[PDB]
Amino acid sequence: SDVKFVPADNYNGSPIIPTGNPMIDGVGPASWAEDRRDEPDLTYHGSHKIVPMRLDPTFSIAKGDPDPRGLPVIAADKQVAGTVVELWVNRSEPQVSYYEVQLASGERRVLLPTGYVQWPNFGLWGNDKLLVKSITAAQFANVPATKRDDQITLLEEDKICAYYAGGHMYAFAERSQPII
Amino acid sequence: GMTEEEARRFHGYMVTGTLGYVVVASVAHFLAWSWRPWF
Amino acid sequence: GMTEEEARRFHGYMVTGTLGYVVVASVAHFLAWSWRPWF
Amino acid sequence: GMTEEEARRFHGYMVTGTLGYVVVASVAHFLAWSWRPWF
Amino acid sequence: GMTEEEARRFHGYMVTGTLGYVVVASVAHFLAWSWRPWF
Amino acid sequence: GMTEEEARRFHGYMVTGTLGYVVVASVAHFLAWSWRPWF
Amino acid sequence: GGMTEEEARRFHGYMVTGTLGYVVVASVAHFLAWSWRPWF
Amino acid sequence: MHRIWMGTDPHIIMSALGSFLVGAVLVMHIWAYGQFNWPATLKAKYATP
Amino acid sequence: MMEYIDGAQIALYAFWLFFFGLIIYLRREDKREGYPLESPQGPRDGWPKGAPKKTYVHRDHG
Amino acid sequence: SVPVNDGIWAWYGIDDDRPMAAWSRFHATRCVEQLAINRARVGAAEWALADVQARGIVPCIAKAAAHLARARAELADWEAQGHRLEAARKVTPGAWTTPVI
Amino acid sequence: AMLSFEKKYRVRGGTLIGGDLFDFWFGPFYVGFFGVTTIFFVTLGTLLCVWGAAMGPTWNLWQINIAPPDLKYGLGLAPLREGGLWQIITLCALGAFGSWALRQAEIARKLGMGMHIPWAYGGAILAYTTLVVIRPFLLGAWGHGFPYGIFSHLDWVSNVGYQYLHFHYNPAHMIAVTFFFTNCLALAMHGSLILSVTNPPKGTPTGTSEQENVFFRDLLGYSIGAIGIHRLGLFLAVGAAVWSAICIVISGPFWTQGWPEWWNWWLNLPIWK
Amino acid sequence: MHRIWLMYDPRRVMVALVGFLAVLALVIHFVLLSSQRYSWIENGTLGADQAPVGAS
Amino acid sequence: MHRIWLMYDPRRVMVALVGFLAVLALVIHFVLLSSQRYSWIENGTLGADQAPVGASAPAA
Amino acid sequence: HRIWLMYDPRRVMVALVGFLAVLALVIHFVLLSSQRYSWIENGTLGADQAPVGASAPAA
Amino acid sequence: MHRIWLMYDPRRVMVALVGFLAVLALVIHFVLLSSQRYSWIENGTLGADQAPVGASAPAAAAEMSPLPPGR
Amino acid sequence: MHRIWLMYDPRRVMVALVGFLAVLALVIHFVLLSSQRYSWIENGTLGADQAPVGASAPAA
Amino acid sequence: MHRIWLMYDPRRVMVALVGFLAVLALVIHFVLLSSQRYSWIENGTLGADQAPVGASAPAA
Ligand SMILES: CCCCCCCCCCCCCC(=O)OC[C@H](COP(=O)(O)OCC(O)COP(=O)(O)OC[C@@H](COC(=O)CCCCCCCCCCCCC)OC(=O)CCCCCCCCCCCCC)OC(=O)CCCCCCCCCCCCC
Ligand code: BCL
Ligand code: BCL
Ligand SMILES: CC[C@H]1c2cc3[nH]c4c(c3C)C(=O)[C@H](C(=O)OC)c4c3nc(cc4[nH]c(cc(n2)[C@@H]1C)c(C(C)=O)c4C)[C@@H](C)[C@@H]3CCC(=O)OC/C=C(\C)CCC[C@H](C)CCC[C@H](C)CCCC(C)C
Ligand SMILES: COC(C)(C)C/C=C/C(C)=C/C=C/C(C=O)=C/C=C/C(C)=C/C=C/C=C(C)/C=C/C=C(\C)CC/C=C(C)/C=C/C=C(\C)C(=O)O
Ligand SMILES: COC(C)(C)C/C=C/C(C)=C/C=C/C(C=O)=C/C=C/C(C)=C/C=C/C=C(C)/C=C/C=C(\C)CC/C=C(C)/C=C/C=C(\C)C(=O)O
Ligand SMILES: COC(C)(C)C/C=C/C(C)=C/C=C/C(C=O)=C/C=C/C(C)=C/C=C/C=C(C)/C=C/C=C(\C)CC/C=C(C)/C=C/C=C(\C)C(=O)O
Ligand SMILES: COC(C)(C)C/C=C/C(C)=C/C=C/C(C=O)=C/C=C/C(C)=C/C=C/C=C(C)/C=C/C=C(\C)CC/C=C(C)/C=C/C=C(\C)C(=O)O
Ligand SMILES: COC(C)(C)C/C=C/C(C)=C/C=C/C(C=O)=C/C=C/C(C)=C/C=C/C=C(C)/C=C/C=C(\C)CC/C=C(C)/C=C/C=C(\C)C(=O)O
Ligand SMILES: CCCCCCCCCCCCO[C@@H]1O[C@H](CO)[C@@H](O[C@H]2O[C@H](CO)[C@@H](O)[C@H](O)[C@H]2O)[C@H](O)[C@H]1O
Ligand SMILES: CCCCCCCCCCCCO[C@@H]1O[C@H](CO)[C@@H](O[C@H]2O[C@H](CO)[C@@H](O)[C@H](O)[C@H]2O)[C@H](O)[C@H]1O
């Protein structure tokens, strides 16, 4: 028994049903491109494209924007998941690709993609906590780990991003059901 | 998934509600017919 | 969800709400009828 | 966080405020009617 | 957050500001009425 | 940092400048009315 | 940075003198304009 | 009979009763001013020729 | 001396033949990923048959 | 420009980060929030310096040290606000029972 | 049939209405409750269009013309052969387009995608609803809608424009046109750039985001960047439809004169009156 | 006969059914409301012999 | 009867109900205001025998 | 009274006020656009002088 | 009802209040300035009996029509 | 009263006020300038009896 | 009064002030130049009695 899903019935257009925890097995909106190349993305000059900002001294926060480091992360159940302790930057097109969150409920640091963070009041004011609608504060403990802490492979990028994407369906049982 | 006795219980309500609606609609047509017949 | 007793008490307000609403509407229709009848 | 005390107290303000508004509006209609009746 | 002490203090400035505004507005209306009544 | 003494001092200037501006605008309206009254 | 209270008063004296001198020129301009073609 | 007031708020009761009376009394007056031709006869008495 | 046939009509059918050629080409390009399709009756290609999956030469070092 | 934390509301004069020596509940709330954030921000900055010293990458060590110093300077700025509000809290009658700092 | 990677994505859940009841596929298509309502309205509307062609003068595709009622019918349903059919088809159209957008929302929720596509389509639905619902309602008769016919609706567009003598002078229309033209330019540049780095001349290595960024920056002087160009393309394409809705709703309900004489306010600014 | 509710969850049918009947009732009323013979808001008081007949 | 509120969330049904009734009430008032016979803001003071009536069938 | 458990007063109060503000503004502008109640221009007319819409023609 | 000051930041309530009053004031002024009767900048010195009043009923001549003949 | 300058930044409110008065004053001048009664650049030398007045009520 | 320059950067104020006076001066001159009475480049040599005046009340 290692197949991640089964057909809901035998008819031709029927959905599949996951056999385990779909966020972890990677089924439905939690699935990732499992064949994706397990190497880092590279710049035009061949250096690692995505690296913690701590390891490239040319990068800095833009003067008008909030510094996310030290801010608390608020998860989907409104509990504090942790605090941001590092930024990861894309060096080909200068931007923040990930926050790295020190978990409050353990010893791990996990990556948090920027596309899953909302700022209070759409960032028009406040700018003093991060909102993560996708997953609960408990589910942060299972965010996929990178093999190293100074680089990330294209496969690890897919696994981490897919994990948060799955939470919009799987974080609470009610999220899968219709509104009416 | 719903059990067969739950389905049987609902079916009794669903038949009765439908037929009650159809009965009320038939009286509405009787009033409309008396006021201004369409045939 | 909700308990069957909590459903029971809610229904009584929803019924009397609907009844009070129908009552005002019925008076409003009789006033309208007395001012300018439509049949 | 609501409580049954907070709810019951707030209900009094909403009820009394609503009714007081409807009283002031009823006078406004009395004045409007006396100036230019719409029936 | 807000204390009742500030909430009660503040309401006193609201009332005096409001009354001053309504007093000025009602003088302004009665001036306008004397110049050119709208009923 | 800002003391309540400085808030009190600034309030003195802000009120005086506001009232002095309204006084100058009063004299302007006195002159304008003398030249060409609008009522 | 900032500005010192002595620098503020030193600036203010020129600022007032500039403003006064400018108002004087504008006053003479308006009186020349008025005696050429009054607007009231 | 008094138990009918148990579980009520007396300030709601007086609010509802008071508002009902204000509504009813106004309606009754504007109706009655219509039927009884008063103050219309009052105005016509003191009106100017 | 052809009354019905005129140059604007001739041009328009010239375009239609090019355009339907172009749609075919684009639908061949659209199948370089995800094809052939899985089916309970075995692989399926749709129509037109897709162009083969490309392999991309990476920048040698930088 | 708008300040980061009051943002759009700074156009209307709400500006709770400004240095305040009188007691004011709004500034106290802001200072408690910003102290916790800046203490965590210092804690992060010195973890970052320790990591880069372990790797030994000199220009990164230099920048991480500069960042830590800057983070300490910002924390000191908020601790100054906390103390001057603490002094006012003790004497202004309506003020909080809990300390600001 | 399924794409080679598709099967693991075909889970239950993400519906707005109906739950598991319609949560299945038919060939490539996702069905769902709004799929069922889509097919209903599409079928009813299309067959009523064929009925409109049958009782009209020709089966010639270009010439079929299902026209709205006379203005005298106001906001009522007209006799079906006198424009009431156009009204029933319009209700089917509104139902079909709304069902399509909600079905897109169900699909996006099932894939863990953002709601950008349903809302972008809402821009087009807004323009259609302006043309057949809002503007005719503000004018007080459904007969102000455009007719359903491949060329007869172009006759309507022509005549509505000349109701304002010189419709090019409509200021919202100038903005809408500028968005449409700017969108098409931006689409040609974005397509060209991605293709030119992914399909370089034979024997050249595959390009990079840096080369794309450098070239673009020589075109406009500034870097738009990867997410920026997709924000721009969405802003331009949807803004074009929104300004189109504005330009037609102000023509008639709010401005009734020729559009050239609207520009009189510019000539009379006090600095140069 | 009750087994259709083992195929179709009744709570998800009944919401669909109500929508269909609400739209159908609105459509029929508006079709009548703007007919000549049944425009009751304006000619409802006529009586059956005076009501229009669509002869031509 | 009350098990309907065990099938459905009462909060949702109340918002659905009030929305339908508000739109329905607005539609009916607009239909009346838009008619001839019931355009009450302009003609509400007319007596029941002077309010408009739509035309009868012809005599033949 | 328990309806206030299901809805936050901080939302409800604004929603109710927003509804009333819109409804009041709608009714005023509908009346102002009428002929009978165009009170800015004609409010000084007596109730017998004020406009009335057309009647049934009887012919 | 002074508990309303517990529900919101009072600084923001004053900003909202000032906005609402300012906008409503400008709405009522420009409505009046657009009317005939209260176009006070042009006609403010007219006496109350001289100020315009909206007509109770326009006349007509039976051959005249304000709108062209329609279809 | 003066504690309002704790609740709001003086430096900031003054800019908002001064900007508002500039805008208000300019609007009122331009509204007057485009009237007939107060087109003072053309007609400012007319006496008050001689200046334009909007059309009156008298009519057939 | 010089404390105002502690509250505001005087170099920001001088820039805002000078720009305001420049625009205001130009606006007034172009308004006057577009007028009839003060079209001074064409008619500046006319005496004060010869210069245009805007239309009066009819007073017929
Ligand atoms: C105006 C200028 C700009 C106008 C701009 C217009 C742009 C239009 C672009 C899109 C048109 C193509 C759409 C498409 O590819 O759908 C997939 C489908 C199937 O192939 P597949 O997807 O690769 O494989 C799946 C299939 O093999 C097995 O799937 P499954 O078993 O799960 O499902 C059952 C089958 C049954 O097959 C069908 O039902 C196909 C019926 C297609 C009819 C519509 C053709 C429209 C051509 C328009 C171009 C032109 C035709 C003249 O598969 C399906 O169920 C697939 C359903 C696809 C539904 C697509 C509906 C598209 C309707 C577009 C209407 C456009 C009207 C303008 O493809 C086809 O069946 C063949 C299409 C071939 C490309 C068109 C080229 C025409 C060139 C001229 C004629 C050439 C003759 C040799
Ligand atoms: C907390 C107090 C209670 C209350 C307690 C009383 C009492 C006690 C009396 C009334 C009376 C009246 N109330 Mg009250 N009333 C309340 C709320 C209301 C509301 C409302 C919108 O909520 C309305 C419309 C009314 C309406 C009315 C009238 C029917 C009546 C005459 C006064 C008046 O017009 O007051 C309009 C309402 C207000 C201005 C606000 C309510 C409070 C004020 C102070 C008025 C009522 C007290 C009155 C002055 C007492 C006089 C002495 C007694 C005769 C012994 N009440 C609140 C909830 N009401 C009197 C009555 O029955 O006369 C026949 C009376 O004796
Ligand atoms: C300096 C502290 C006080 C002050 C102290 C006094 C005193 C003291 C007197 C007045 C007087 C007057 N003040 Mg005061 N006054 C102040 C601010 C104001 C403001 C304002 C916008 O803030 C205004 C409109 C006024 C207006 C007025 C007049 C109504 C009145 C008559 C004199 C006059 O014409 O002064 C013209 C000036 C102005 C309109 C503006 C400038 C204000 C000047 C700087 C204040 C001093 C004026 C005083 C008359 C000087 C000579 C008297 C000395 C005691 C010898 N003052 C400040 C805040 N004012 C007098 C009065 O009431 O007589 C019956 C009077 O005795
Ligand atoms: C808002 C910016 C632009 C925009 C965007 C846009 N359009 C979109 C989308 C987006 C983002 C989609 O997601 C959606 C889609 O799925 O595309 C594949 C769509 C789409 N844009 C479409 C077309 C379209 N968009 C247009 C315009 C625009 N679309 C805007 C300019 C036009 C124009 C200007 O003419 C057309 C024709 C469709 C291909 C598709 C929506 C498909 C859909 O709704 O499907 C369900 C309905 C049917 C298949 C048929 C309904 C039939 C009716 C019941 C009967 C016919 C009535 C009709 C009114 C008759 C008209 C006759 C004409 C000759 C006048
Ligand atoms: C212009 O002219 C044109 C339009 C063109 C002319 C043509 C028109 C056409 C073609 C019309 C077609 C019409 C049609 C065709 O079929 C119409 C079909 C109508 C139908 C089927 C109506 C059915 C109504 C059913 C109702 C109302 C049921 C109510 C049920 C209730 C209330 C109870 C529910 C159960 C509960 C509450 C359980 C409680 C206990 C529980 C839970 C427990 O105990 O556990
Ligand atoms: C132009 O002519 C056209 C238009 C074309 C012609 C066509 C017309 C047509 C087709 C009309 C259709 C009409 C229709 C249906 O079809 C109409 C259906 C109407 C209905 C059903 C109305 C129901 C109203 C109910 C109301 C107002 C309830 C009020 C009160 C409530 C809720 C309770 C409040 C208290 C609460 C909540 C707290 C409880 C305790 C709690 C929570 C606790 O204690 O826990
Ligand atoms: C003309 O043509 C067309 C338009 C077509 C014709 C048709 C028109 C139609 C369809 C009209 C429909 C009308 C309608 C339908 O519902 C109208 C419904 C109106 C309603 C519901 C009015 C209700 C108003 C309620 C008010 C004002 C409440 C005030 C409360 C106050 C003041 C107290 C606040 C409480 C606080 C502060 C709490 C303190 C304690 C706290 C915080 C604590 O204790 O914690
Ligand atoms: C013509 O056609 C159409 C337009 C259609 C017709 C229809 C129009 C309609 C529908 C109109 C509706 C109008 C309306 C409805 O509600 C209008 C409602 C108006 C209202 C509510 C006005 C309220 C004004 C209140 C004011 C000004 C208060 C000011 C308070 C001040 C200044 C004090 C500030 C605090 C200080 C100084 C110190 C604090 C100290 C502290 C903290 C400390 O010391 O600690
Ligand atoms: C066409 O007609 C339409 C338009 C249609 C008709 C309608 C029109 C309408 C609706 C109009 C509304 C008008 C309105 C409504 O509110 C108008 C309200 C106007 C107001 C409030 C004006 C207030 C002016 C206040 C001023 C000028 C203050 C100046 C202060 C000064 C100078 C001192 C500053 C402090 C200093 C110097 C100390 C620093 C010390 C320091 C640093 C230290 O000590 O350290
Ligand atoms: C058109 C723009 C505005 C034109 C008006 C200009 C102002 C005209 C009147 C000015 C009169 C003097 O105004 C007066 O100045 C003194 C300082 O000198 C201010 O005094 C203020 O600061 C002092 C400390 O320096 C505090 O102790 C005092 O409580 C406070 O009010 C007063 O608040 C103000 O009332
Ligand atoms: C006692 C007076 C003390 C000083 C008062 C200062 C008053 C300053 C101007 C007040 C009016 C400004 O105008 C008012 O601005 C608020 C600011 O939120 C707007 O408020 C709204 O829009 C803003 C953005 O613009 C949103 O962020 C906000 O959530 C929303 O409520 C109002 O829609 C507008 O009417």
* Residues paired with K66 in a beta bridge: K148
K255 is in an annotated binding site: no
Strands A16-18 and A95-103, sheet pairing: unpaired
Contact by Cβ (8 Å): K17, A178: yes
Contact by Cβ (8 Å): C35, D39: yes
D13 is in an annotated binding site: no
How far does chain N reach from its first CA to its final CA, in angstroms?
A: 59
Q: How far apart are CA A85 and CA A2, in angstroms?
A: 37
Nearest CA in chain Q to K272: Q34
Minimal C-alpha gap between J48 and chain P (Å): 37
Element (H, E) at A63: none
Strands A80-90 and A109-113, sheet pairing: unpaired
User: Coil, strand, or helix at residue A102?
Assistant: strand
Q: Does F16 contact ligand 3 (Cβ within 6 A)?
A: yes
- Name the residue with the closest Cα to ligand 7, atom 24: D18
Contact by Cβ (8 Å): K68, K82: no
Residue O46 has, within 13 A of its CA and on its CB side, a CA count of 25
Report yes or no on chains A and D touching (3+ CB pairs under 8 A): no
How far does chain E reach from its first CA to its final CA, in angstroms?
A: 49
Query: CB distance J20–P6 less than 8 Å?
Result: yes
Contact by Cβ (8 Å): J14, A125: no
J9 and chain O in contact, CB less than 8 A: yes
Q: How far apart are CA I30 and CA A7, in angstroms?
A: 28
C29 and chain M in contact, CB less than 8 A: no
Residue N23 corresponds to which amino acid?
L
K116 is in an annotated binding site: no
Q: Does K94 contact ligand 4 (Cβ within 6 A)?
A: no
Q: How many CB atoms lie within 10 A of CB K177?
A: 16
Query: CB distance E5–J94 less than 8 Å?
Result: yes
Q: Which residue has the tokens 């209903």?
A: K40
In chain M, residues with a C-beta closer than 8 Å to the C-beta of N42 are none
D1 and chain N in contact, CB less than 8 A: no
Using a 10 angstrom Cβ sphere, with 0-12 exposed, 13-18 middle and 19 or more buried, the burial of residue K36 is middle
Structure tokens at J23: 């007691």
Distance from CA of residue K55 to its chain's centroid?
A: 29
Helix axes K226-249, K171-198, angle to 10 degrees: 160
Cα dist. E21→A74, B16, E15, E25, E28 in Å?
44, 63, 10, 6, 10
Contact by Cβ (8 Å): J67, A162: no
Distance from CA of residue K56 to its chain's centroid?
A: 28
Contact by Cβ (8 Å): K67, K53: no
Interface test with M, best of C13, C15, C35 (most M CBs within 10 A): C35
The breaks in chain F (C to N more than 2.5 Å) occur after none
Minimal C-alpha gap between F39 and chain O (Å): 4
Strands A16-18 and A5-7, sheet pairing: antiparallel
Residue J11 corresponds to which amino acid?
W
Q: What is the DSSP letter of K19?
A: G
User: Coil, strand, or helix at residue K201?
Assistant: coil
What spacing in Å lies between the alpha carbon of O8 and ligand 11's midpoint? 14
Structure tokens at K4: 């080679």
b/e per residue, K10-27, with b = 16+ CB within 10 A? bbbbbbbbbbbbbbbbee
> Virtual CA dihedral for J64, J69, J70, J75, nearest 10 degrees?
130
Q: How far apart are CA K27 and CA K20, in angstroms?
A: 18
Q: Does O19 contact ligand 11 (Cβ within 6 A)?
A: yes
Q: What is the DSSP letter of A17?
A: E
Q: How many CB atoms lie within 10 A of CB K244?
A: 23
In chain N, residues with a C-beta closer than 8 Å to the C-beta of E39 are 39, 43-44
Contact by Cβ (8 Å): A110, A140: yes
Q: Does F15 contact ligand 3 (Cβ within 6 A)?
A: no
Give the residue among M16, F10, K199 at the shortest CA–CA distance from A179: M16
Q: How far apart are CA K212 and CA K229, in angstroms?
A: 12
Q: How far apart are CA G26 and CA E3, in angstroms?
A: 55
Q: How far apart are CA K215 and CA K220, in angstroms?
A: 9
Using a 10 angstrom Cβ sphere, with 0-12 exposed, 13-18 middle and 19 or more buried, the burial of residue C6 is middle
In chain K, residues with a C-beta closer than 8 Å to the C-beta of L27 are 91
Nearest CA in chain A to I59: A44
User: Coil, strand, or helix at residue K2?
Assistant: strand
Q: How far apart are CA A60 and CA A87, in angstroms?
A: 10
Give the residue among A56, A49, A54 at the shortest CA–CA distance from A84: A54
Contact by Cβ (8 Å): K10, K25: yes
Query: CB distance F7–P5 less than 8 Å?
Result: yes
Q: How far apart are CA J57 and CA J52, in angstroms?
A: 6
Nearest CA in chain J to P20: J12
Q: Which residue has the tokens 């009884």?
A: H36
Query: CB distance F4–P38 less than 8 Å?
Result: no
Distance from CA of residue L23 to its chain's centroid?
A: 8
Strands A50-52 and A72-74, sheet pairing: unpaired
Q: How far apart are CA O42 and CA O46, in angstroms?
A: 9
What spacing in Å lies between the alpha carbon of H18 and ligand 2's midpoint? 6
Contact by Cβ (8 Å): O51, O43: yes
Contact by Cβ (8 Å): A130, A71: yes
Pocket test for ligand 10, best of F8, F13, F27 (most atoms within 8 A of CB): F13
Q: Does I24 contact ligand 1 (Cβ within 6 A)?
A: yes
> Virtual CA dihedral for C4, C5, C8, C12, nearest 10 degrees?
-160
D11 is in an annotated binding site: yes
Q: Which residue has the tokens 């088809």?
A: K89
Contact by Cβ (8 Å): O10, E2: yes
Give the residue among K51, K52, K63 at the shortest CA–CA distance from K155: K63
Residue N32 corresponds to which amino acid?
L
User: Coil, strand, or helix at residue A72?
Assistant: strand
Helix axes J58-91, J25-55, angle to 10 degrees: 160
Helix axes P10-33, F4-35, angle to 10 degrees: 10
Cα dist. N9→A78, N17, N21 in Å?
20, 12, 18
K190 is in an annotated binding site: yes
Q: How far apart are CA P44 and CA P32, in angstroms?
A: 12
Give the residue among A118, P22, I32, L39 at the shortest CA–CA distance from K78: L39
Q: How far apart are CA A21 and CA J1, in angstroms?
A: 48
In chain N, residues with a C-beta closer than 8 Å to the C-beta of O32 are 40
Residue K242 corresponds to which amino acid?
V
- Interface residues of chain L, partner chain B, Cβ below 8 Å: 1-6, 9-10, 37-38, 48, 51
DSSP J65-78: HHHHHHHHHHHHHH
Q: How far apart are CA J47 and CA K138, in angstroms?
A: 65
User: Coil, strand, or helix at residue Q56?
Assistant: coil
Give the residue among K50, K122, K132, K130 at the shortest CA–CA distance from K91: K132
Binding-site entries of F for bacteriochlorophyll a? 21, 29, 38
Nearest ligand (C-alpha, residue B38):
5
> Virtual CA dihedral for K10, K12, K18, K24, nearest 10 degrees?
30
- Return the ∠ at Cα J23 (arms to J17 and J27), rounded to 5°: 20
Enumerate residues 6+ apart whose C-beta is below 8 A from L43. L51, L52, M53, M54, M55, M56
Q: How far apart are CA A13 and CA K28, in angstroms?
A: 9
* Residues paired with A98 in a beta bridge: A88, A113
Nearest ligand (C-alpha, residue N31):
7
Q: How far apart are CA C10 and CA M6, in angstroms?
A: 11
Structure tokens at E11: 């309401």
Pocket test for ligand 8, best of E8, E9, E18 (most atoms within 8 A of CB): E18
Nearest CA in chain P to J24: P6
Q: What is the CA radius of gyration of chain B?
A: 16
Contact by Cβ (8 Å): A133, A76: yes
Declared resolution, Å: 2.5
Query: CB distance N4–D36 less than 8 Å?
Result: no
Structure tokens at O36: 């005939």
Minimal C-alpha gap between K261 and chain Q (Å): 21
Q: How far apart are CA A165 and CA P22, in angstroms?
A: 52
Structure tokens at K135: 């503007």
Q: How far apart are CA P4 and CA F15, in angstroms?
A: 12
Nearest CA in chain C to L38: C39
Q: How far apart are CA P31 and CA P26, in angstroms?
A: 9
Strands A16-18 and A50-52, sheet pairing: unpaired
DSSP F1-39: -B-HHHHHHHHHHHHHHHHHHHHHHHHHHHHHHHHS---
Binding-site entries of G for a bacteriochlorophyll? 12, 30
What are B16-23's contacts with CB under 8 Å, separation 24+?
A: none
Give the residue among K22, K61, K16 at the shortest CA–CA distance from K40: K22
Cα dist. K198→I55, K211, K217, N1 in Å?
11, 11, 18, 66
For residue I48, say if its preceding peptide bond is cis, omega within 30 degrees of 0: yes
Q: How far apart are CA K256 and CA F21, in angstroms?
A: 45
Q: What is the CA radius of gyration of chain A?
A: 18
Report yes or no on chains C and A touching (3+ CB pairs under 8 A): no
Helix axes K226-249, K116-129, angle to 10 degrees: 20
Give the residue among K61, K38, K66 at the shortest CA–CA distance from K51: K66
Element (H, E) at K25: strand K25-26
Q: How far apart are CA K162 and CA P37, in angstroms?
A: 39
Q: How far apart are CA Q59 and CA P36, in angstroms?
A: 15
Q: How far apart are CA P57 and CA O15, in angstroms?
A: 43
Structure tokens at A37: 């190349």
Residue E1 has, within 13 A of its CA and on its CB side, a CA count of 10
Contact by Cβ (8 Å): P34, Q34: no
Query: CB distance K8–A166 less than 8 Å?
Result: no
Phi and psi for O58 in degrees, rounded to 5?
-65, 150
- Name the residue with the closest Cα to ligand 2, atom 24: H19
Distance from CA of residue K42 to its chain's centroid?
A: 17
User: Coil, strand, or helix at residue M21?
Assistant: helix
Distance from CA of residue C2 to its chain's centroid?
A: 24
E strands along chain A, which residues? 5-7, 16-18, 50-52, 72-74, 80-90, 95-103, 109-113, 130-131
Element (H, E) at K26: strand K25-26
Cα dist. A48→A44, A98, A154, K214 in Å?
10, 15, 11, 19
Residue I22 has, within 13 A of its CA and on its CB side, a CA count of 6
> Virtual CA dihedral for I11, I17, I22, I23, nearest 10 degrees?
120
Cα dist. D14→D6, D21, M29 in Å?
12, 10, 28
Q: How many CB atoms lie within 10 A of CB G33?
A: 14
What count of residues does chain G have? Answer: 40
Give the residue among E27, N17, E10 at the shortest CA–CA distance from O20: N17
* Residues paired with A96 in a beta bridge: A89
Q: How far apart are CA K105 and CA K16, in angstroms?
A: 8
Contact by Cβ (8 Å): A156, A144: yes
User: Coil, strand, or helix at residue N48?
Assistant: coil
User: Coil, strand, or helix at residue A92?
Assistant: coil
Q: How many CB atoms lie within 10 A of CB K51?
A: 15
What spacing in Å lies between the alpha carbon of M7 and ligand 6's midpoint? 18
Name chain Q's partners: 3 or more CB pairs within 8 A: G, K, P
Q: What is the CA radius of gyration of chain J?
A: 17
Contact by Cβ (8 Å): K145, K68: yes
User: Coil, strand, or helix at residue P51?
Assistant: coil
Q: Which residue has the tokens 């009052």?
A: H42
What count of residues does chain D have? Answer: 39
Q: What is the sign of the dihedral through the CA atoms of H26, H28, H31 and H37? A: negative
Q: How far apart are CA J5 and CA I57, in angstroms?
A: 48
What spacing in Å lies between the alpha carbon of G15 and ligand 10's midpoint? 19
Structure tokens at A106: 């353990």
- Name the residue with the closest Cα to ligand 1, atom 9: I23
Q: Which residue has the tokens 């001159």?
A: Q29
Q: How far apart are CA I12 and CA I14, in angstroms?
A: 5
E33 and chain O in contact, CB less than 8 A: no
Structure tokens at A164: 């948060």
Strands A130-131 and A72-74, sheet pairing: parallel
* Residues paired with M51 in a beta bridge: none
Give me the residue from H12, H18, H30 closest to D12, CB to CB: H12
Pocket test for ligand 9, best of O20, O26, O31 (most atoms within 8 A of CB): O26
Structure tokens at P26: 């300019």
* Residues paired with I37 in a beta bridge: I44
b/e per residue, Q35-60, with b = 16+ CB within 10 A? bebbebeeeeeeeeeebeebeeeeee
User: By what method was this entry solved?
Assistant: cryo-EM
Phi-psi region of Q9 (alpha: psi -120 to 50; beta: other; left: phi over 0): beta
- Name the residue with the closest Cα to ligand 4, atom 11: K121
Q: Does F20 contact ligand 3 (Cβ within 6 A)?
A: yes
Phi-psi region of K32 (alpha: psi -120 to 50; beta: other; left: phi over 0): left
Minimal C-alpha gap between M3 and chain N (Å): 19
Q: What is the CA radius of gyration of chain Q?
A: 20
Q: How many CB atoms lie within 10 A of CB H28?
A: 10
Report yes or no on chains Q and P touching (3+ CB pairs under 8 A): yes
Contact by Cβ (8 Å): A131, A84: no
- Name the residue with the closest Cα to ligand 9, atom 26: F18
